[PDB]
Amino acid sequence: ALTNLEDSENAKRAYEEAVRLDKCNPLVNLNYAVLLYNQGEKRDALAQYQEMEKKVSSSLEFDPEMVEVAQKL
């Protein structure tokens, strides 16, 4: 919600709380990786992708964006 509110540093720190708290749900890592990529970062986006793949669980839309971020990194 914060990413779409022109407020991305709070999005960063919220994602930081989320990844420290979450264990068995890779969608948090995928969304954080997408945020980092769209922020042009792309270096720790691979760290988030790695945290996600360490947690694999397939929603019909959770796979396409995953593999699209994958081929991009």
Next chain:
Amino acid sequence: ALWEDRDVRFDVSSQQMKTRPGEVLIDCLDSVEDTKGNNGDRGRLLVTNLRIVWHSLALPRVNLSIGYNCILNITTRTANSKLRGQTEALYVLTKCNSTRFEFIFTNLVPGSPRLYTSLIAVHRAYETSKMYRDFKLRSALIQNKQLRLLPQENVYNKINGVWNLSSDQGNLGTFFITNVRIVWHANMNDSFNVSIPYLQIRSVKIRALVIESSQQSGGYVLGFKIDPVEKLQESVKEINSLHKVYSANPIFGVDYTDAFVAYFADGNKQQDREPVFSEELGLAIEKLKDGFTLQGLWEV
């Protein structure tokens, strides 16, 4: 030029937040807070000869200047019961450059402030003393072959035979030169008179005597002819000397960028569409928006 009584400005420069030469400060109060802007910014309110100035008292960059010829409704709201003291509030409602502004000034200190009474009193004096600083046509200036003087006014000279080079039949009149204005009134039909205050006079000269008034409040070209050219130039000298001595310190007769969007009286609206005639109501009503209708706006 004089604008502190005519406009409502926001984020004023600290040089314009300072007393204009003819202006005098009347009262002040600290810890006044600005509502109708929900910033919670404490400030300080100042009532002067010609306007009310509020400034943040912490970041004086953000501030407001409201003229007395712009305020329509000045009301006092005594509320906020025992929970604390009676934090009196003030409600100013203004119409500047065809837009309605609303300012709310809340005195944070619980005591009742004496400033809110001096405000209304000086505003009353301002409104009742507009013969000092405005142009008037065909008004009531003469009791009986004799002028009616303002509070702070002395008549300096009275010239006769003064024609008016703006009409053709009611011309032979009298000219009163004073320390606050020059007036001319016809002999017959003494209701044909003009009164020009020095604040409005921009240039007096001969062309047979021509007053050119300030284009900021209507640029008129008033011409008067006198029989002896000697008296003509004498009167020109007197008028211009009085204009300059008045200009150094104006009397005023008062006896005693996108931030403005937040101060709308209406609300998210700053211009009125053109008034047309409504055949439904039989009255003049402002032009309706595209989709709306009168019976679709009246219903709830």
Next chain:
Amino acid sequence: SLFKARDWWSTVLGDKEEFDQGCLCLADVDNTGNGQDKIIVGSFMGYLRIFNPHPAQAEDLLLEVHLRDPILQVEVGKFVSGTEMLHLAVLHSRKLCVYSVSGTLGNVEHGNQYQIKLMYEHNLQRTACNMTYGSFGGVKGRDLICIQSVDGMLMVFEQESYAFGRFLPGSLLPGPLAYSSRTDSFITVSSCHQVESYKYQVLAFAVVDWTLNIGEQAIDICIVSFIQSASSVFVLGERNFFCLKDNGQIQFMKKLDYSPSCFLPYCSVSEGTINTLIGNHNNMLHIYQDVTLKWATQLPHVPVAVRVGCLHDLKGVIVTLSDDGHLQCSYLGTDPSLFQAPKVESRELNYDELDMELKELQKVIKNVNKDLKVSAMVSPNSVTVKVTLKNRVALQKIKLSIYVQPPLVLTGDQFTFEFMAPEMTRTVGFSVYLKG
């Protein structure tokens, strides 16, 4: 801007003035023949001011004459024998004066002058209160006027000639007076809440044609005749609104839940109905077709007279006038402005000052969890005790009270010190004794 009287040419009209109904008039007093209207305003001081708004400015005021005595009523109509040109009649307590506002042009728009020339005057042997005018009988091209003295007497003047005067029967205070032409009748609202209609010929010959016991007394009464399909006598009571037939009974009535000040039935739009316009003492105008509220809008001031006229190429402009002096032309505001907080960028939150204060208050909050000496001396002798109390600051609202026991009794029980200035001493003395 929805439901507000959006402003037009407007001006405050004096220095602590006083106006009433019959002061505000709105017609073509200059006889320009075009069709625009000119705002005429008398005063309770004498300032007959005629304006022609051109949207303020200084070309608006046609003239601001000052007559000696107060101006009770102002009207515009054919008040002169020969000519069929509108004249201006002004009514003071003991004088009727019919003028003629003649304007002669100058080569420049601020060189044209206007003069009011006294066309005749009648002395009043009684103190008037108001007046009405019409074609008394069926005479054409004339507007002869009936003036109601404050002691209940209709003095009828056919223009330039005092016709007669009849004492209204059974009246103590004076009420609103109107004239109906479809019935050729004067209509009054007497003090005993009785709307009474008299026939003009019966008055000229002297009685009451008809009466109707409305429940109150009336502020204004307007017999509106723009429509000839069916004449109807409108009455604004001090609590109710009435429209009455020509025979006498109530065509309809509304029970206003407010205190009306002025009303004006202007032209109608539908078939048979009549749009009307009533102003509150809550400074609000109500537009009512029949009794149905068709609109309601907030006025700036509590109107004392409202009119609706065509001013400078705009029909149906509402012209209100108060008793302070606020004269205002206006139209109705029909913009349902959106309800949204303003999207300002300059105005932001001064987080530093506010956060210092918030940390201060939160400090007091988290801290809340973790100067007057009184001495009593008993004399060794109903023994007399003396209490000495001293401060070190400027204490206020001090109250001292003594409690001994049920059986024991004191001669003085309470002592009130409203304010005692700092480092000061107070000393009270009472005496206690056994009772029982």
Next chain:
Amino acid sequence: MFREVLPKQGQLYVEDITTMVLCKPKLLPLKSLTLEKLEKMQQAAQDTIHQQ
């Protein structure tokens, strides 16, 4: 670019465990004109008494 994928399942109660009830928000009633005037008159009487 990539839009943010969101969960779609949501959260569901499996049992109605008892809880504590809060009172509900209160819409203050609007006073009539006659009631306002009666309150005004009695407050004005109290005031004109207090000034002595």
Next chain:
Amino acid sequence: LNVPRKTRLYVDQTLREREAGTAMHRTFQADLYLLRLRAARAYVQALESSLSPVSREPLKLHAVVQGLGPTFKLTLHLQNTSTARPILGLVVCFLYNEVLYALPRAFFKVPLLVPGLNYPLETFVKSLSDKGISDIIKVLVLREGQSTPLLSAHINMPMSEGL
């Protein structure tokens, strides 16, 4: 099911939120910061003046006025709200207008408040005003030794309706 009906107002406002949600979010966060500030302010003031009838030293007090005549039974319900410890040293003072009201015992001590029990302490106020004139009456509960009210209650005494 009785699932409600959503009119055009709902869709227009969810549209205005879909377009301009960021302005709404920012202005709500600003107004909430201001609200926390004002609430902390008023709460600190009430702590300062001891105006709260509920605030170690666990106590609670409210007052009831019963009666419509020139005499009222003012009953103070005082309760010690703690696991297990009594409150020994307490007193109750009444701050009133000594012209309008006649209280026989303004100051009186308070019994050993057993934890969990409500103590109703009665008093008889008497309206002395020959007209109908009301006024407030404050009640301070405070320890004997100290001088700062442990808590306070306020009572708007009703109109006399007497003679």
Next chain:
Amino acid sequence: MEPLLLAWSYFRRRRFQLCADLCTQMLEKSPCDQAAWILKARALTEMVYVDEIDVDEEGIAEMILDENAIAQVPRPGTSLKGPSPAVRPVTQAGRPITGFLRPSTQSGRPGTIEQAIKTPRTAYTARPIASSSGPFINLSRLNLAKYAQKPKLAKALFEYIFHHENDVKTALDLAALSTEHSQYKDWWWKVQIGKCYYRLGLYREAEKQFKSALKQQEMVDTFLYLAKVYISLDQPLTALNLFKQGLDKFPGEVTLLCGIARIYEEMNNISSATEYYKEVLKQDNTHVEAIACIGSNHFYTDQPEVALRFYRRLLQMGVYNCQLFNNLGLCCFYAQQYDMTLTSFERALSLAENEEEVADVWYNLGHVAVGTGDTNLAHQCFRLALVSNNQHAEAYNNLAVLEMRRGHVEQAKALLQTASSLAPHMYEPHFNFATISDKIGDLQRSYAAAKKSEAAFPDHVDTQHLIKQLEQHFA
């Protein structure tokens, strides 16, 4: 200019003081001028004038010791004696909170005299309940037999005696003499005598005069008075029929339709109250009563956006209160208009002119806080609602809920006991106390509290489950 003329003009313009004073002057100057005398009378009596239709006031004597209803167990639906209490707050057991306070709303009846003295003085009335419901001219001196010969003085003097001096006996004497003089053929004196009787408590002798006035001249005031009488005799259907007959005479009168709506809402039939309020809207569209009632109803039946529209309409028409702005902030927070909520609440707090209004606004701000998800700000707001009004049972209940959420069970129990002692008609503190008592055992108090819960709101399901559990334990 002149004294009498200017006094008249001042009086017309609702000055009521300059004309009174100038009349005192003109009376002292010329001891023989009755016009100024009756004008001073008018000014005096209109400074204080109040609508007699709206002055319906009932004391404890008139509630208990005055019996005028014929039936004693009338069919449900034919006598005066929606959102459930789990949604819409209540003032008493029944009659949930309304949207508009008139000085005649009852919202219940106290049973005994003990039940009435031992209850907050504004629980069944819109003003503190009572036991029963120099000078200008001396009433004993002037002989009504003389004034009643001349109606111009008679009507003004009667209005003075009845509305200023409030001496219904001398007023009725003058009205009787004056009706004698006018030979009984003017509806006004009949309606005045009827009002005098209705004040004295004689409802049938007043119905007689109102009926005799309706036969002479059908006017809105007589219908309103007669329906007021028919409601004093506890006959709501006679009043509905009379209102419908009035609306047959006056096809669209708003006062009659609003009377019908008030009756249907006191019989607790909101389906027709709202229909007749909607008719009032189709006629007036600025009616504060109709708009407030429909707005509250919309807010409570899961439609805060429509209630927001209605209250925004009340705000456009120039209403500026504390109640209006509290309602606006609430409808905004619940319509999800988060940009206009807290500023409306701050405006409400500014406009509040009591200590109960401030307490209600802090209570609602605490609800906004609870919604936002911060229990500390909510805690402070409920505690400030208590600071501003110590007898605020809802603030106690919500503060005890938050306390029990923190873990402070004893604080919560004491607060819930204070709440359920302040408002016994409120089911929430009873239910909460019973729940947290049963959680800790103490089934005696748990049952004693569940029973009062079910007494306050009987169709509550959780209370039924708890009562059944406890009764199983008892056996």
